[PDB]
Amino acid sequence: TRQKQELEEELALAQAYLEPLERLAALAHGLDKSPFLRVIPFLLTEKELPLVEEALRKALEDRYLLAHEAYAGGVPALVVVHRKEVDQAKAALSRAGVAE
């Protein structure tokens, strides 16, 4: 029964979050294990996408990279920012109400 519970919880999460993580991984392929670049994953709905972009753009100038790729419904979005620009990047998501 213990195996069975672990097997069932794993399925339940994996069934939910495989498609976003696939999308997100793909967007910054081979750049998630680099120290030079920082990646932050987050989910946005069609509604939220414009607000988030504005907020990041003012906060982070034009030396930030906002990319998104669909999955059937909203977009999992990835913002890629320089290392040591992490706090600022985060602060920008937090003001819109979007989190990591």
Partner: protein
């Protein structure tokens, strides 16, 4: 904006660091060797 910009720029940032560390060690290396050979000339000369 393509991911290719930062991707293929990162893999150059790593080469620039590597040459830095190389020619740091390959310089000090020379000096340590040159310090030995100098003090051998100072023994060779001094006893003769």
């Amino acid at each position: 904006g393509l991911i290719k910009s930062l991707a293929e720029k990162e893999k150059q940032l790593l080469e620039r660091l590597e040459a830095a560390k190389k020619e740091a060690e390959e310089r000090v290396k020379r000096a340590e060797a040159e310090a030995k050979a100098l003090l051998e000339e100072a023994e060779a000369k001094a006893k003769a």
